[PDB]
Amino acid sequence: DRINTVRGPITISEAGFTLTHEHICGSSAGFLRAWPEFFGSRKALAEKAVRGLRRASAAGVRTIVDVSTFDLGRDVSLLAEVSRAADVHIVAATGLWLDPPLSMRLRSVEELTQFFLREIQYGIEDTGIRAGIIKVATTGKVTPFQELVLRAAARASLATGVPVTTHTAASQRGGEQQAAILESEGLSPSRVCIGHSDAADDLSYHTALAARGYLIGLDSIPHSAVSWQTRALLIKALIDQGYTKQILVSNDWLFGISSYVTNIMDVMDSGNPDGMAFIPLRVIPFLREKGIPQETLAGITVTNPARFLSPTLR
Amino acid sequence: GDRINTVRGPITISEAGFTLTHEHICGSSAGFLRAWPEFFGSRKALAEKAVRGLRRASAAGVRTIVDVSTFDLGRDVSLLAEVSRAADVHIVAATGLWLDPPLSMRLRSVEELTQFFLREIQYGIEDTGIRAGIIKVATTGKVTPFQELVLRAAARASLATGVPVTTHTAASQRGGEQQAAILESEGLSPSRVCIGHSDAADDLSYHTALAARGYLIGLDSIPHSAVRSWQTRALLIKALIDQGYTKQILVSNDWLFGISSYVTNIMDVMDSGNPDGMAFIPLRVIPFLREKGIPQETLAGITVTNPARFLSPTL
Numbered sequence: 001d002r003i004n005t006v007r008g009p010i011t012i013s014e015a016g017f018t019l020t021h022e023h024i025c026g027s028s029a030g031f032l033r034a035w036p037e038f039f040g041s042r043k044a045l046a047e048k049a050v051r052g053l054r055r056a057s058a059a060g061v062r063t064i065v066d067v068s069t070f071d072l073g074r075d076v077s078l079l080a081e082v083s084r085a086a087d088v089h090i091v092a093a094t095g096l097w098l099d100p101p102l103s104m105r106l107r108s109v110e111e112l113t114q115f116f117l118r119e120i121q122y123g124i125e126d127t128g129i130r131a132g133i134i135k136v137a138t139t140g141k142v143t144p145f146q147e148l149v150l151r152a153a154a155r156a157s158l159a160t161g162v163p164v165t166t167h168t169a170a171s172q173r174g175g176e177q178q179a180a181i182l183e184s185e186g187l188s189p190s191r192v193c194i195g196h197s198d199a200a201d202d203l204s205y206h207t208a209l210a211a212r213g214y215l216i217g218l219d220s221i222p223h224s225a226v227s228w229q230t231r232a233l234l235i236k237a238l239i240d241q242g243y244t245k246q247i248l249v250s251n252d253w254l255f256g257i258s259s260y261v262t263n264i265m266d267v268m269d270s271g272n273p274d275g276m277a278f279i280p281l282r283v284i285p286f287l288r289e290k291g292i293p294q295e296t297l298a299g300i301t302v303t304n305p306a307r308f309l310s311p312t313l314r
Numbered sequence: 315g316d317r318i319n320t321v322r323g324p325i326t327i328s329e330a331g332f333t334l335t336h337e338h339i340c341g342s343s344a345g346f347l348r349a350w351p352e353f354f355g356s357r358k359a360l361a362e363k364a365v366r367g368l369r370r371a372s373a374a375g376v377r378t379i380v381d382v383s384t385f386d387l388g389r390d391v392s393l394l395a396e397v398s399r400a401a402d403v404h405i406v407a408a409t410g411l412w413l414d415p416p417l418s419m420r421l422r423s424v425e426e427l428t429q430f431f432l433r434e435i436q437y438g439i440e441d442t443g444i445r446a447g448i449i450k451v452a453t454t455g456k457v458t459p460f461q462e463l464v465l466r467a468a469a470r471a472s473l474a475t476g477v478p479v480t481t482h483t484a485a486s487q488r489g490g491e492q493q494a495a496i497l498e499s500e501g502l503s504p505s506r507v508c509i510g511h512s513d514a515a516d517d518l519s520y521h522t523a524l525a526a527r528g529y530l531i532g533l534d535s536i537p538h539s540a541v542r543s544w545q546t547r548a549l550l551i552k553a554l555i556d557q558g559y560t561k562q563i564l565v566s567n568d569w570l571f572g573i574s575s576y577v578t579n580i581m582d583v584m585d586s587g588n589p590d591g592m593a594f595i596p597l598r599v600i601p602f603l604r605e606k607g608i609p610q611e612t613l614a615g616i617t618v619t620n621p622a623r624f625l626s627p628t629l
């Protein structure tokens with residue numbers, strides 16, 4: 001069985017150590033091509049991303065899932081150039097984040113389903129690069145449009161086997177409403193990662209979703225470094241409850257950011273100079289010294305993402 | 315001010331001819347036509363419909379359109395250049411921002427927005443080398459804080475380059491008055507500004523006071539009433555002529571050949587109500603005004619001389 005990357009299909013075995021929630025650039029639709037000098041230049045942003053991915057490579061990372069959607073300014077040609085030059089697999093995403101323009105906002109659930117299908121089954125833009133995941137974002141209480149997006153995501157996942165990954169505010173238990181809507185469409189929890197779950201510290205929330213078969217995205221560990229040790233101990237708490245197979249870990253890093261105040265990227269890079277290598281270089285050794293076996297950590301960073309990303313019509 | 319930027323390169327002022335100063339090839343959102351061309355049937359189908367529509371307009375005398383679609387209306391300048399070449403009609407492209415800026419625009423300072431508008435006029439749009447010839451700005455209400463930044467950045471790009479500013483209001487709220495106050499605070503001459511969508515309200519005192527201050531008055535959406543009648547909208551042109559303000563009038567259709575930034579199928583409703591498309595101004599409004607007694611020299615002044623003076627980069 002095979003996973004779509006920006007360089008074409010790969011086998012499950014080739015994915016290796018996978019970071020399941022990352023971004024090359026957090027931007028807006030059209031913005032990198034209209035104003036590349038916001039980032040210095042397109043070449044500067046690509047170079048910064050290739051160096052950072054090569055360093056993550058130096059640490060063991062073999063695949064990242066770029067969960068930038070259309071409205072996060074995903075530029076799959078950028079992703080392809082960076083993947084090739086870093087020699088790291090990148091999974092592209094479809095879906096919608098929190099900044100849809102009018103042309104998306106106004107669409108029905110049936111139209112949105114066709115757009116997500118197009119990106120999975122045909123390709124993104126005119127590139128022929130197919131998405132391997134669907135990303136959906138909600139506010140704490142899901143809005144009417146966000147509910148349409150979740151329903152279209154579920155329908156596109158049921159038709160193609162590709163998984164869904166979510167943005168929450170876990171501070172607001174946002175995954176419970178997302179999961180209820182997704183299940184109303186018949187989507188299996190084993191096809192869904194409830195993301196940004198490391199921003200909440202009520203373990204009851206994490207364990208209940210994991211007991212239903214959801215993947216738990218503990219995906220923003222180094223954002224607390226801008227305590228990260230405490231967020232990483234959520235990984236250990238889920239392992240200790242018996243939910244190893246439900247854990248996904250990532251940095252939620254980026255190499256350029258225009259969807260926030262200017263110069264935020266410099267602040268972030270000062271708090272986490274390891275960038276995407278933070279998970280393999282800091283978190284993994286930390287969990288090792290708390291007594292988690294290497295085998296458990298390999299299961300979380302290799303086997304769990306492979307099972308999550310492999311298209312499964314179940 | 316001897317040449318104007320078009321999607322085919324510079325043209326001299328005399329080549330612009332009959333100009334429609336507020337039009338769109340497609341009303342959409344940034345990145346959308348590239349990501350989902352099948353919303354419009356296909357990219358080829360949208361292009362072919364726009365070529366037939368422009369050629370229609372050209373046979374009715376139009377020589378240039380100003381496509382006032384900004385980044386956030388999904389302007390695709392490569393689509394504009396293709397259509398301009400195939401229809402042999404000049405198209406002036408725009409910079410600026412309309413009412414749907416994404417977060418990456420909404421979070422920018424006035425200095426940052428000024429640099430963006432300047433790059434699209436002085437360097438080029440995207441990697442195409444096609445340079446804007448107008449700055450479009452939309453406001454609502456009394457002008458929001460972000461919209462005020464856009465207006466100020468627009469005035470600053472105008473004053474550095476000479477290209478004019480054209481606005482989207484609400485004439486029913488006299489919203490041009492607030493735009494004019496902000497733009498004048500920046501030192502921009504009213505003769506470099508069109509207050510647009512002024513035909514949406516039959517408030518003659520509003521129009522004449524802005525015209526007397528030197529603003530151009532954009533009576534730019536006449537057939538939207540055919541989708542207040544269109545004739546009533548067209549009599550606002552006659553009223554300004556009769557007050558001696560012919561030099562301040564700009565007319566247009568505000569037409570589109572595809573629309574994704576509204577409900578599905580609105581383009582079909584619109585086309586059924588105005589089958590003339592962008593030829594509505596020359597086929598319907600111009601003969602209506604002739605029949606009301608407006609002479610040829612005045613109509614050529616409105617449709618040729620005023621757009622030339624407005625678009626020529628000045629000061």
Ligand SMILES: C[As](C)(=O)[O-]
Pocket residue numbers: 026072167252
């Ligand atoms: C683009 As984000 C901060 O929602 O991972």
Ligand SMILES: C[As](C)(=O)[O-]
Pocket residue numbers: 341387482568
């Ligand atoms: C795109 As419009 C209706 O403001 O001209």
Ligand SMILES: [Zn+2]
Pocket residue numbers: 137167168196
């Ligand atoms: Zn997120």
Ligand SMILES: [Zn+2]
Pocket residue numbers: 021022023067252
């Ligand atoms: Zn993210």
Ligand SMILES: [Zn+2]
Pocket residue numbers: 452482483511
């Ligand atoms: Zn408008």
Ligand SMILES: [Zn+2]
Pocket residue numbers: 336337338382568
């Ligand atoms: Zn318009």
